[PDB]
Coordinates of C-alpha atoms and ligand atoms in Angstrom, one line a residue:
Chain A
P1 CA -28.1 -45.7 230.6
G2 CA -31.3 -43.6 230.9
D3 CA -34.9 -43.5 229.7
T4 CA -35.6 -41.2 226.7
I5 CA -38.5 -39.5 225.1
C6 CA -37.9 -37.7 221.8
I7 CA -40.0 -35.3 219.8
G8 CA -40.1 -35.9 216.1
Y9 CA -42.1 -35.7 212.8
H10 CA -43.6 -38.0 210.2
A11 CA -41.7 -39.4 207.2
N12 CA -43.0 -41.7 204.5
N13 CA -42.2 -43.0 201.0
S14 CA -43.9 -40.1 199.1
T15 CA -42.2 -38.7 196.0
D16 CA -44.5 -35.7 195.7
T17 CA -42.5 -32.5 195.0
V18 CA -43.6 -28.9 195.3
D19 CA -42.1 -25.6 194.7
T20 CA -41.6 -22.8 197.2
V21 CA -40.1 -19.3 196.8
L22 CA -36.8 -20.2 198.4
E23 CA -36.4 -23.7 196.9
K24 CA -37.8 -25.8 194.0
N25 CA -38.6 -29.5 194.0
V26 CA -39.1 -30.1 197.7
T27 CA -40.2 -33.6 198.4
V28 CA -43.0 -33.6 200.9
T29 CA -45.0 -36.2 202.8
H30 CA -48.4 -35.1 201.5
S31 CA -49.7 -32.7 198.9
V32 CA -52.7 -32.0 196.7
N33 CA -53.0 -31.3 193.0
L34 CA -55.0 -28.1 192.3
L35 CA -54.7 -28.2 188.5
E36 CA -57.2 -30.4 186.6
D37 CA -55.7 -31.8 183.4
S38 CA -58.2 -34.6 182.7
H39 CA -61.2 -34.7 180.4
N40 CA -63.3 -37.5 179.0
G41 CA -62.6 -36.6 175.3
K42 CA -66.3 -36.5 174.4
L43 CA -69.1 -34.1 173.9
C44 CA -71.8 -34.4 176.5
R45 CA -75.2 -33.1 177.5
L46 CA -75.3 -30.2 179.9
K47 CA -78.0 -30.8 182.5
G48 CA -79.4 -33.6 180.4
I49 CA -79.8 -31.5 177.3
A50 CA -77.9 -32.4 174.2
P51 CA -75.9 -29.8 172.2
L52 CA -76.8 -28.9 168.6
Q53 CA -74.3 -30.5 166.3
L54 CA -74.2 -28.5 163.1
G55 CA -71.8 -31.1 161.6
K56 CA -70.9 -30.1 158.0
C57 CA -73.2 -27.1 158.3
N58 CA -72.6 -23.6 159.9
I59 CA -75.0 -21.2 161.4
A60 CA -75.8 -19.6 158.0
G61 CA -76.7 -22.9 156.4
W62 CA -78.7 -23.9 159.5
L63 CA -80.9 -20.8 159.7
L64 CA -81.3 -20.2 155.9
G65 CA -82.1 -23.9 155.5
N66 CA -79.3 -25.0 153.2
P67 CA -80.6 -28.3 151.8
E68 CA -77.4 -30.1 153.1
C69 CA -78.6 -29.2 156.6
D70 CA -82.1 -30.8 156.4
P71 CA -81.4 -33.1 159.4
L72 CA -81.3 -30.0 161.6
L73 CA -84.8 -28.8 160.7
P74 CA -86.6 -30.8 163.5
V75 CA -84.2 -29.9 166.3
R76 CA -85.9 -27.3 168.6
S77 CA -83.8 -27.0 171.8
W78 CA -80.2 -27.3 172.8
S79 CA -77.7 -26.8 175.7
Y80 CA -75.0 -25.4 173.4
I81 CA -74.0 -25.2 169.7
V82 CA -71.1 -27.1 168.1
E83 CA -69.5 -26.2 164.8
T84 CA -66.8 -28.4 163.4
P85 CA -63.6 -27.7 161.3
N86 CA -65.7 -29.0 158.4
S87 CA -68.6 -26.7 159.0
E88 CA -68.6 -25.5 155.4
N89 CA -72.3 -25.5 154.2
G90 CA -73.6 -22.0 154.7
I91 CA -74.8 -19.8 151.8
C92 CA -75.1 -21.9 148.7
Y93 CA -76.0 -19.1 146.3
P94 CA -73.0 -16.7 146.6
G95 CA -73.3 -13.3 148.3
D96 CA -72.9 -11.5 151.5
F97 CA -74.6 -12.4 154.8
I98 CA -74.9 -8.9 156.5
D99 CA -74.1 -8.6 160.2
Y100 CA -73.6 -12.4 160.3
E101 CA -71.3 -12.2 163.4
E102 CA -73.9 -10.3 165.3
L103 CA -76.5 -12.9 164.3
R104 CA -74.2 -15.6 165.7
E105 CA -73.8 -13.6 168.9
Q106 CA -77.6 -13.5 169.1
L107 CA -78.0 -17.2 168.7
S108 CA -75.4 -17.7 171.6
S109 CA -78.0 -16.9 174.2
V110 CA -80.9 -18.8 172.5
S111 CA -81.8 -22.0 174.2
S112 CA -84.8 -23.1 172.0
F113 CA -86.9 -21.7 169.3
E114 CA -90.0 -22.5 167.2
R115 CA -89.7 -22.9 163.5
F116 CA -92.9 -21.7 161.9
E117 CA -94.2 -20.7 158.5
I118 CA -94.3 -16.9 158.7
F119 CA -95.4 -16.6 155.0
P120 CA -97.0 -19.9 153.8
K121 CA -96.0 -20.9 150.3
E122 CA -99.4 -21.8 148.9
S123 CA -101.3 -18.7 150.2
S124 CA -99.0 -15.7 150.4
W125 CA -98.0 -15.1 146.8
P126 CA -101.1 -15.6 144.6
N127 CA -99.7 -13.4 141.8
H128 CA -96.1 -14.6 141.8
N129 CA -94.2 -17.8 141.1
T130 CA -92.8 -19.4 144.2
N131 CA -90.7 -21.9 142.4
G132 CA -87.2 -20.5 141.7
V133 CA -84.4 -22.9 142.2
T134 CA -80.7 -22.9 141.5
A135 CA -78.0 -25.5 140.9
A136 CA -75.9 -23.7 143.5
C137 CA -78.3 -25.1 146.0
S138 CA -78.7 -28.6 144.6
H139 CA -80.3 -31.4 146.7
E140 CA -79.9 -35.0 145.5
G141 CA -78.6 -33.6 142.1
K142 CA -81.6 -31.5 141.3
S143 CA -81.6 -27.7 141.5
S144 CA -83.3 -26.5 144.7
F145 CA -83.4 -23.7 147.3
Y146 CA -83.2 -22.8 151.0
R147 CA -85.9 -24.6 153.0
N148 CA -86.7 -21.3 154.9
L149 CA -86.7 -18.8 152.0
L150 CA -88.7 -18.5 148.7
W151 CA -87.6 -17.2 145.4
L152 CA -90.3 -15.0 144.0
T153 CA -90.3 -14.6 140.2
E154 CA -92.5 -13.1 137.4
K155 CA -95.8 -14.9 136.8
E156 CA -97.2 -14.6 133.2
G157 CA -94.8 -11.8 132.2
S158 CA -95.5 -9.2 134.9
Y159 CA -94.0 -8.8 138.4
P160 CA -96.8 -6.9 140.2
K161 CA -95.8 -4.8 143.2
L162 CA -96.3 -6.9 146.3
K163 CA -96.9 -5.8 149.9
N164 CA -97.3 -8.5 152.6
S165 CA -97.0 -8.2 156.3
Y166 CA -96.8 -10.4 159.4
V167 CA -97.7 -9.5 163.0
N168 CA -95.7 -11.1 165.8
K169 CA -98.4 -12.7 168.0
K170 CA -95.9 -15.4 169.2
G171 CA -95.3 -13.4 172.4
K172 CA -91.5 -13.9 171.8
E173 CA -88.9 -12.4 169.6
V174 CA -89.1 -13.6 166.0
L175 CA -85.9 -14.0 164.0
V176 CA -86.7 -13.1 160.3
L177 CA -84.3 -13.7 157.4
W178 CA -84.7 -12.7 153.8
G179 CA -82.6 -12.2 150.7
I180 CA -81.9 -9.8 147.9
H181 CA -81.0 -11.2 144.5
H182 CA -78.6 -9.2 142.2
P183 CA -78.7 -10.7 138.7
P184 CA -75.5 -10.5 136.7
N185 CA -77.0 -8.7 133.6
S186 CA -80.0 -6.6 132.6
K187 CA -81.4 -9.5 130.6
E188 CA -81.7 -11.8 133.6
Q189 CA -83.2 -9.0 135.6
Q190 CA -86.0 -8.2 133.2
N191 CA -86.6 -11.9 132.6
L192 CA -87.0 -12.7 136.3
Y193 CA -88.7 -9.6 137.6
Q194 CA -89.9 -7.5 134.5
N195 CA -89.0 -4.2 136.1
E196 CA -85.4 -3.2 135.5
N197 CA -85.7 -0.5 138.1
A198 CA -86.8 -2.6 141.1
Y199 CA -86.5 -2.2 144.8
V200 CA -87.3 -4.0 148.1
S201 CA -88.3 -2.3 151.4
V202 CA -88.4 -4.1 154.8
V203 CA -89.8 -2.1 157.7
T204 CA -90.8 -2.9 161.3
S205 CA -91.4 -0.4 164.0
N206 CA -87.6 -0.2 164.7
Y207 CA -86.1 -1.4 161.4
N208 CA -86.1 0.5 158.1
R209 CA -84.1 -0.6 155.1
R210 CA -84.5 -0.2 151.3
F211 CA -82.7 -2.3 148.8
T212 CA -81.7 -1.7 145.1
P213 CA -80.3 -4.4 142.8
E214 CA -76.7 -3.9 141.7
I215 CA -76.5 -5.6 138.3
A216 CA -73.0 -6.5 137.0
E217 CA -71.1 -9.5 135.8
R218 CA -69.0 -10.8 138.6
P219 CA -66.4 -13.6 139.0
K220 CA -68.4 -16.9 139.0
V221 CA -68.7 -18.5 142.5
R222 CA -70.4 -21.9 142.7
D223 CA -71.0 -21.4 139.0
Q224 CA -73.0 -18.1 139.5
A225 CA -72.2 -14.6 138.3
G226 CA -75.3 -13.4 140.1
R227 CA -75.3 -12.6 143.8
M228 CA -77.7 -12.9 146.8
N229 CA -77.3 -10.8 149.9
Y230 CA -78.9 -12.1 153.1
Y231 CA -80.4 -9.9 155.9
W232 CA -82.1 -10.5 159.2
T233 CA -83.8 -8.6 162.0
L234 CA -85.5 -9.4 165.3
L235 CA -89.2 -8.7 165.4
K236 CA -90.3 -7.6 168.8
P237 CA -93.4 -9.2 170.3
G238 CA -96.5 -7.5 169.0
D239 CA -94.6 -5.7 166.3
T240 CA -95.3 -5.9 162.5
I241 CA -92.8 -6.5 159.7
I242 CA -93.8 -5.3 156.2
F243 CA -92.2 -6.4 152.9
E244 CA -92.7 -4.4 149.7
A245 CA -91.1 -5.1 146.4
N246 CA -91.4 -5.0 142.6
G247 CA -88.6 -7.5 142.2
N248 CA -85.5 -9.2 143.5
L249 CA -87.0 -10.2 146.9
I250 CA -86.0 -13.6 148.4
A251 CA -88.9 -13.7 150.7
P252 CA -89.1 -15.3 154.2
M253 CA -91.1 -18.5 154.3
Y254 CA -90.1 -19.9 157.7
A255 CA -89.1 -17.8 160.7
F256 CA -88.0 -18.6 164.3
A257 CA -89.7 -17.7 167.6
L258 CA -86.8 -17.5 170.0
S259 CA -86.5 -18.2 173.7
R260 CA -83.5 -16.9 175.6
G261 CA -81.3 -18.9 178.0
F262 CA -78.1 -18.5 180.0
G263 CA -74.8 -20.1 179.8
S264 CA -75.0 -21.3 176.2
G265 CA -72.5 -20.6 173.4
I266 CA -70.9 -21.7 170.2
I267 CA -67.8 -23.8 170.2
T268 CA -65.8 -25.6 167.5
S269 CA -64.9 -29.2 168.2
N270 CA -63.2 -32.3 166.7
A271 CA -64.9 -34.4 169.3
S272 CA -67.8 -36.9 169.1
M273 CA -71.1 -36.8 171.0
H274 CA -71.4 -39.5 173.7
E275 CA -74.0 -40.8 176.2
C276 CA -72.7 -38.7 179.1
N277 CA -73.8 -35.8 181.2
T278 CA -71.5 -33.1 182.4
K279 CA -71.5 -29.7 184.3
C280 CA -68.5 -28.5 182.3
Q281 CA -67.8 -28.9 178.6
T282 CA -64.7 -27.9 176.7
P283 CA -64.1 -28.4 172.9
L284 CA -61.6 -31.1 173.8
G285 CA -63.8 -33.0 176.2
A286 CA -65.9 -32.8 179.4
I287 CA -64.4 -32.0 182.8
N288 CA -65.7 -33.7 186.0
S289 CA -63.7 -31.9 188.7
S290 CA -63.8 -30.0 191.9
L291 CA -60.3 -28.5 191.4
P292 CA -60.1 -24.7 191.0
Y293 CA -57.8 -24.6 187.9
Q294 CA -57.4 -26.4 184.7
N295 CA -55.0 -26.3 181.7
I296 CA -57.2 -28.1 179.3
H297 CA -58.8 -25.4 177.3
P298 CA -59.7 -21.7 177.6
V299 CA -63.2 -22.3 176.0
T300 CA -65.7 -23.6 178.5
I301 CA -69.4 -24.2 178.8
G302 CA -71.1 -24.7 182.1
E303 CA -69.3 -24.4 185.5
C304 CA -65.6 -25.0 185.1
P305 CA -62.3 -24.6 186.8
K306 CA -60.3 -21.5 185.8
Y307 CA -58.1 -21.9 182.8
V308 CA -54.3 -21.2 183.4
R309 CA -51.2 -21.7 181.4
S310 CA -49.5 -23.7 184.3
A311 CA -48.1 -27.1 183.8
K312 CA -48.1 -27.8 187.6
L313 CA -50.0 -26.4 190.6
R314 CA -49.4 -28.6 193.6
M315 CA -49.9 -27.4 197.1
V316 CA -48.0 -29.1 200.0
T317 CA -50.2 -30.1 202.9
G318 CA -47.7 -32.3 204.8
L319 CA -44.1 -31.8 205.7
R320 CA -40.6 -32.0 204.2
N321 CA -40.1 -35.7 203.6
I322 CA -36.9 -36.7 205.3
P323 CA -36.9 -40.5 205.7
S324 CA -34.0 -41.8 207.7
Chain B
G1 CA -36.4 -23.9 208.0
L2 CA -37.4 -20.7 209.7
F3 CA -37.9 -22.3 213.2
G4 CA -34.9 -24.5 213.3
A5 CA -36.5 -27.8 214.1
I6 CA -37.4 -29.8 210.9
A7 CA -34.3 -30.5 208.9
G8 CA -32.6 -28.5 211.7
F9 CA -31.8 -29.8 215.2
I10 CA -34.2 -32.6 214.5
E11 CA -32.3 -33.9 211.5
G12 CA -34.8 -36.4 210.1
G13 CA -38.3 -37.7 210.0
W14 CA -39.7 -41.1 211.3
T15 CA -41.1 -43.6 208.9
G16 CA -42.1 -45.6 212.0
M17 CA -44.6 -42.9 213.2
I18 CA -47.3 -43.7 210.7
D19 CA -50.4 -42.1 212.2
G20 CA -49.7 -38.3 212.5
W21 CA -47.4 -35.5 211.4
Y22 CA -45.8 -34.9 214.8
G23 CA -45.1 -37.0 217.8
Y24 CA -43.0 -39.0 220.2
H25 CA -40.5 -41.8 220.4
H26 CA -40.0 -43.3 223.8
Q27 CA -37.6 -45.8 225.4
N28 CA -37.8 -47.2 228.9
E29 CA -37.4 -50.6 230.5
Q30 CA -40.8 -51.8 229.3
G31 CA -39.6 -51.1 225.7
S32 CA -39.8 -48.5 222.9
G33 CA -42.2 -47.1 220.4
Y34 CA -43.7 -44.3 218.4
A35 CA -46.9 -42.4 219.2
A36 CA -48.4 -39.4 217.3
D37 CA -49.3 -36.4 219.3
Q38 CA -53.0 -36.3 218.3
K39 CA -53.7 -32.7 219.3
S40 CA -50.9 -30.9 217.5
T41 CA -51.5 -33.0 214.4
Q42 CA -55.2 -32.2 214.5
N43 CA -54.7 -28.5 215.0
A44 CA -52.3 -28.5 212.0
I45 CA -54.9 -30.5 209.9
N46 CA -57.6 -27.9 210.8
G47 CA -55.3 -25.1 209.6
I48 CA -54.3 -26.7 206.3
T49 CA -57.8 -27.8 205.5
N50 CA -58.9 -24.2 206.0
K51 CA -55.9 -23.0 203.8
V52 CA -56.8 -25.4 200.9
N53 CA -60.4 -24.4 201.2
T54 CA -59.5 -20.7 201.1
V55 CA -57.9 -21.2 197.7
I56 CA -61.0 -23.1 196.5
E57 CA -63.4 -20.5 197.8
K58 CA -61.6 -17.6 196.4
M59 CA -61.4 -19.0 192.8
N60 CA -65.2 -19.6 192.8
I61 CA -66.4 -20.9 189.4
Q62 CA -65.6 -20.0 185.8
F63 CA -68.9 -19.6 183.9
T64 CA -69.3 -20.0 180.2
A65 CA -66.5 -18.3 178.2
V66 CA -66.3 -18.9 174.4
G67 CA -64.5 -17.5 171.4
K68 CA -66.0 -14.6 169.4
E69 CA -66.1 -14.0 165.7
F70 CA -65.1 -10.9 163.7
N71 CA -65.4 -10.2 160.0
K72 CA -62.4 -9.1 157.8
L73 CA -62.9 -5.4 158.5
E74 CA -63.0 -5.9 162.3
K75 CA -59.4 -6.6 162.9
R76 CA -58.9 -3.9 165.5
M77 CA -61.8 -5.3 167.5
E78 CA -60.5 -8.8 167.0
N79 CA -57.1 -7.7 168.4
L80 CA -58.8 -5.9 171.3
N81 CA -60.7 -9.0 172.2
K82 CA -57.5 -11.0 172.1
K83 CA -55.6 -8.5 174.2
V84 CA -58.4 -8.8 176.8
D85 CA -58.3 -12.6 176.8
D86 CA -54.5 -12.8 176.9
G87 CA -54.3 -10.1 179.6
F88 CA -56.7 -11.9 182.0
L89 CA -54.9 -15.2 181.3
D90 CA -51.5 -13.7 182.2
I91 CA -52.9 -12.4 185.4
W92 CA -54.7 -15.5 186.6
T93 CA -51.7 -17.7 185.7
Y94 CA -49.5 -15.4 187.7
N95 CA -51.9 -15.2 190.7
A96 CA -52.3 -19.0 190.7
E97 CA -48.6 -19.9 190.5
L98 CA -47.6 -17.3 193.0
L99 CA -50.3 -18.1 195.5
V100 CA -49.2 -21.7 195.5
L101 CA -45.4 -20.9 195.8
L102 CA -46.0 -18.4 198.7
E103 CA -48.5 -20.7 200.5
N104 CA -46.2 -23.7 200.1
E105 CA -43.4 -21.7 201.8
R106 CA -45.7 -20.8 204.7
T107 CA -47.1 -24.3 205.0
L108 CA -43.6 -25.8 205.6
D109 CA -42.7 -23.0 208.0
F110 CA -46.0 -23.8 209.8
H111 CA -45.1 -27.4 210.4
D112 CA -41.6 -26.4 211.4
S113 CA -43.1 -24.1 214.0
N114 CA -45.5 -26.8 215.2
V115 CA -42.7 -29.3 215.8
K116 CA -40.7 -26.6 217.6
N117 CA -43.6 -25.7 219.8
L118 CA -44.2 -29.3 220.7
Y119 CA -40.5 -29.7 221.7
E120 CA -40.7 -26.6 223.9
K121 CA -43.9 -27.9 225.4
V122 CA -42.2 -31.1 226.5
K123 CA -39.0 -29.4 227.7
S124 CA -41.2 -27.1 229.8
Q125 CA -43.0 -30.0 231.5
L126 CA -39.8 -31.9 232.3
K127 CA -37.7 -28.9 233.6
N128 CA -34.6 -30.4 235.3
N129 CA -36.0 -33.9 235.6
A130 CA -34.4 -34.6 232.2
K131 CA -31.4 -33.7 230.2
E132 CA -31.6 -32.2 226.7
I133 CA -29.4 -34.5 224.6
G134 CA -30.1 -32.9 221.2
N135 CA -31.7 -34.2 218.1
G136 CA -35.0 -33.5 219.9
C137 CA -34.5 -36.1 222.7
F138 CA -34.7 -35.9 226.5
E139 CA -32.9 -38.2 228.8
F140 CA -34.8 -38.6 232.0
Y141 CA -32.9 -38.4 235.3
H142 CA -35.4 -40.9 236.7
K143 CA -37.2 -44.1 235.7
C144 CA -40.1 -43.2 233.4
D145 CA -42.4 -46.1 232.9
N146 CA -45.2 -46.3 230.3
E147 CA -47.7 -44.4 232.5
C148 CA -45.1 -41.6 233.1
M149 CA -44.4 -41.6 229.4
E150 CA -48.1 -41.2 228.6
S151 CA -48.4 -38.3 231.1
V152 CA -45.6 -36.5 229.2
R153 CA -47.4 -37.2 225.9
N154 CA -50.7 -35.8 227.1
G155 CA -49.4 -32.9 229.2
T156 CA -49.9 -34.1 232.8
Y157 CA -46.4 -35.0 233.7
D158 CA -45.9 -34.8 237.5
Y159 CA -42.7 -32.9 238.0
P160 CA -42.5 -33.0 241.8
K161 CA -43.3 -36.7 241.9
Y162 CA -39.9 -37.3 240.4
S163 CA -37.8 -34.3 241.4
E164 CA -36.0 -35.9 244.4
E165 CA -35.0 -39.1 242.5
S166 CA -34.0 -36.8 239.6
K167 CA -31.9 -34.4 241.8
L168 CA -30.0 -37.4 243.2
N169 CA -29.2 -38.9 239.8
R170 CA -28.3 -35.4 238.5
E171 CA -26.2 -35.2 241.8
Ligands
LIG1 C1 -45.1 -46.5 199.1 O1 -45.2 -47.8 199.5 C2 -46.4 -48.5 199.3 C3 -46.3 -49.8 199.9 O2 -45.1 -50.1 200.5 C4 -44.3 -51.1 199.8 O3 -45.0 -52.0 199.0 C5 -44.2 -53.1 198.4 C6 -43.9 -52.7 197.0 C7 -43.0 -53.5 199.2 O4 -41.8 -52.8 198.8 C8 -43.2 -53.2 200.7 O5 -42.0 -53.6 201.4 C9 -43.5 -51.7 201.0 O6 -44.1 -51.6 202.2 C10 -46.6 -48.5 197.8 O7 -48.0 -49.0 197.5 C11 -48.0 -50.3 197.2 O8 -47.9 -50.6 195.8 C12 -47.9 -51.9 195.4 C13 -47.8 -52.0 193.9 O9 -46.7 -52.8 193.5 C14 -49.3 -52.5 195.9 O10 -49.3 -53.9 195.5 C15 -50.6 -54.2 195.0 O11 -51.6 -54.5 196.0 C16 -52.9 -54.7 195.5 C17 -53.9 -54.8 196.7 O12 -53.5 -55.9 197.6 C18 -53.6 -55.5 199.0 O13 -52.3 -55.5 199.6 C19 -52.1 -55.0 201.0 C20 -51.9 -56.2 201.9 O14 -53.2 -56.7 202.4 C21 -53.3 -54.1 201.4 O15 -52.9 -53.2 202.5 C22 -53.7 -53.2 200.2 O16 -54.5 -52.1 200.6 C23 -54.4 -54.1 199.1 O17 -55.7 -54.3 199.6 C24 -52.9 -56.0 194.6 O18 -54.1 -56.2 194.1 C25 -51.9 -55.7 193.5 O19 -51.8 -56.9 192.7 C26 -52.0 -56.5 191.4 O20 -50.9 -56.0 190.8 C27 -49.7 -56.9 190.8 C28 -48.6 -56.2 190.1 O21 -48.2 -55.1 190.9 C29 -50.1 -58.2 190.0 O22 -49.0 -59.1 190.1 C30 -51.3 -58.8 190.7 O23 -51.7 -60.1 190.1 C31 -52.5 -57.8 190.8 O24 -53.0 -57.6 189.4 C32 -50.5 -55.3 194.0 O25 -49.9 -56.5 194.6 C33 -49.4 -52.3 197.4 O26 -50.7 -52.8 197.8 C34 -49.3 -50.9 197.7 N1 -49.4 -50.7 199.1 C35 -50.5 -50.1 199.7 C36 -50.4 -50.0 201.2 O27 -51.4 -49.8 199.1 C37 -46.5 -47.1 197.1 O28 -46.3 -47.3 195.7 C38 -47.6 -46.8 195.1 O29 -48.5 -47.9 195.3 C39 -49.8 -47.8 194.6 C40 -50.8 -47.3 195.6 C41 -49.7 -47.0 193.3 O30 -50.1 -45.7 193.5 C42 -48.3 -47.2 192.7 O31 -48.2 -46.5 191.5 C43 -47.3 -46.5 193.7 O32 -45.9 -46.7 193.3 C44 -45.2 -46.4 197.6 N2 -45.2 -45.1 197.1 C45 -44.3 -44.6 196.2 C46 -44.5 -43.1 195.9 O33 -43.4 -45.3 195.8
LIG2 C1 -67.8 -37.3 188.5 O1 -66.8 -37.9 189.3 C2 -67.2 -38.4 190.6 C3 -66.0 -39.0 191.3 O2 -64.8 -38.6 190.6 C4 -68.4 -39.5 190.4 O3 -68.8 -39.8 191.7 C5 -70.2 -40.1 192.0 O4 -70.7 -39.1 192.8 C6 -72.0 -39.3 193.3 C7 -72.5 -38.0 194.0 O5 -71.4 -37.5 194.8 C8 -72.1 -40.5 194.1 O6 -73.4 -40.8 194.5 C9 -71.5 -41.7 193.4 O7 -71.4 -42.8 194.2 C10 -70.1 -41.4 192.8 N1 -69.7 -42.5 191.9 C11 -69.0 -43.5 192.3 C12 -68.6 -44.5 191.2 O8 -68.6 -43.6 193.4 C13 -69.5 -38.9 189.5 O9 -70.4 -39.9 189.2 C14 -68.9 -38.3 188.2 N2 -69.9 -37.8 187.3 C15 -70.0 -38.2 186.0 C16 -71.1 -37.6 185.2 O10 -69.2 -38.9 185.5
LIG3 C1 -53.2 -38.7 230.4 O1 -52.3 -39.7 230.9 C2 -52.5 -40.1 232.3 C3 -51.5 -41.1 232.7 O2 -51.6 -42.3 232.0 C4 -54.0 -40.6 232.5 O3 -54.3 -40.9 233.8 C5 -54.4 -42.3 234.0 O4 -55.2 -42.9 233.0 C6 -55.4 -44.3 233.1 C7 -56.4 -44.7 232.0 O5 -55.9 -45.8 231.2 C8 -55.9 -44.7 234.5 O6 -55.9 -46.2 234.7 C9 -55.0 -44.1 235.6 O7 -55.6 -44.4 236.9 C10 -55.0 -42.6 235.4 N1 -54.3 -41.9 236.5 C11 -54.7 -40.8 237.1 C12 -53.9 -40.3 238.1 O8 -55.8 -40.3 236.8 C13 -55.0 -39.6 231.9 O9 -56.3 -40.1 232.0 C14 -54.6 -39.2 230.5 N2 -55.6 -38.3 229.9 C15 -56.1 -38.4 228.7 C16 -57.1 -37.3 228.3 O10 -55.8 -39.3 227.9
NAG4 C1 -58.4 -32.5 165.1 O1 -57.9 -33.8 165.2 C2 -56.6 -34.1 164.7 C3 -56.4 -35.6 164.8 O2 -57.4 -36.3 164.1 C4 -55.6 -33.3 165.5 O3 -54.3 -33.6 165.0 C5 -55.9 -31.8 165.3 O4 -55.0 -31.0 166.0 C6 -57.4 -31.5 165.7 N1 -57.7 -30.1 165.4 C7 -57.5 -29.1 166.2 C8 -57.8 -27.7 165.7 O5 -57.0 -29.2 167.3

């Protein structure tokens, strides 16, 4: 029998639920998801630049020039580096790659480099044979060798003491790799290098190492009882590297002039390259998101939401939903 | 709820009030209807926009973070790197889930307070020209046509204009 005005609040058909400290699973009229769980399932460019897909190769094989990795030779610049679960082609002549993980760490901040012939084949070794190959590094069925190194062997029965140098006028850091062969028996030693008591020395202004062959018969690996250890160093702009040997030197032929970048890295991924561009790449896929968190993957390239273990992060914006 | 209005003395919400979080239902001789209170809705929207954007701003951006490699004689360093990664992950998961739980509790209490404040605002305009009949409703002691209704909804209700008619009906 009287006019009424009532104060009240909104209800709707939302089934959004959120958690609170006093109560779980409160149904609320509006809410917002803060946890990105979506990715495109692909590898993408980062700022228009494609990643470097090593495929069946790993960093070792890429930088030594394992012949299985030949398709990587022309690639000069990348946004990130992708290894795969099948990234198996590294060293093909067995041995140790010294401070390999440090070398990978160094390549993680490289964004492009220049492959150049530090010690040209046809003009650096007039008194040595630059022709050694091995079946451990076969290409197309024929014995071969790393496209960035050069096996020096005796020429006409004598291995004269060599001493060559290079001066880094590239105005950037030069990554230099070389190798040290360890024959399995004294016969092979003398046959390849004619000086059973050989040595190699590599020196820059800040690097100083001397190498001695260790000759022994070891378990065969890729059908080789011999060994080859691999070494690297960064040559500072304007500095000089000097090699000196009377045997066993696997000499540099190609080297890399590096340019540093930011926000690069190495990741391992099942996923396939695609014609897409992204600001945020995980190994499972690319994220296109403004949300602050994500439960997709802890490994991220670019500018990504923060990884958390959470299954659900939903923030209520509206009200308790109480439809009448 | 902490302020006693939502799911309290106003037992339920209104599917019929589609255009804001809080508002009014009226009934007079000209009819009945819902109207959202634009101002209290907008103030709440400003607050919660700012709350959402605070979470966003404080998390910033995760820059490039990748795995690291250790050889077979670097196990201690490998485990230390893993302890660091797992430690940070525990902490950010904890911070994120807790921030949301605690802020969700405060967001609901905020709405509860807004509804309560709106009710007290109307009650304070109407004084004894209306009866509190519970469930958030006022029964006018006088005829309140659509213009009078609107003056309540926008905070210009003329109490003396109706006091005499109201005193008589209140007898
Ligand atoms: C809360 O309610 C919303 C609507 O309310 C109900 O809707 C129906 C089901 C009845 O029960 C009503 O009494 C009641 O009000 C729900 O959203 C609604 O979902 C349905 C899906 O079945 C959707 O219907 C589709 O509409 C599109 C677009 O057509 C226009 O329709 C209206 C009228 O003009 C317009 O306002 C809209 O904006 C659209 O422009 C139409 O293309 C669809 O057809 C396609 O799919 C059907 C099969 O479903 C197929 O046969 C067709 O041939 C064609 O392929 C379809 O008819 C309603 O439009 C929509 N309502 C609104 C306002 O958008 C809501 O459910 C949620 O709806 C979706 C948005 C989606 O997220 C669903 O997964 C959700 O369940 C509901 N919320 C919850 C939490 O339950
Ligand atoms: C990432 O997602 C957004 C939306 O989820 C896409 O939206 C585009 O954003 C640009 C700039 O804000 C707009 O100019 C376009 O109109 C939006 N697209 C559409 C279809 O509306 C954005 O393109 C996505 N990016 C990628 C690389 O997929
Ligand atoms: C608040 O409500 C009052 C009551 O309706 C408004 O005052 C009237 O507004 C209508 C406009 O449609 C006029 O026709 C009347 O003449 C007004 N009456 C008086 C005494 O001014 C008032 O304008 C409303 N204020 C706002 C901001 O909406
Ligand atoms: C790679 O892909 C397979 C499916 O083809 C999947 O089951 C597997 O888990 C993936 N590898 C990793 C390390 O996630």
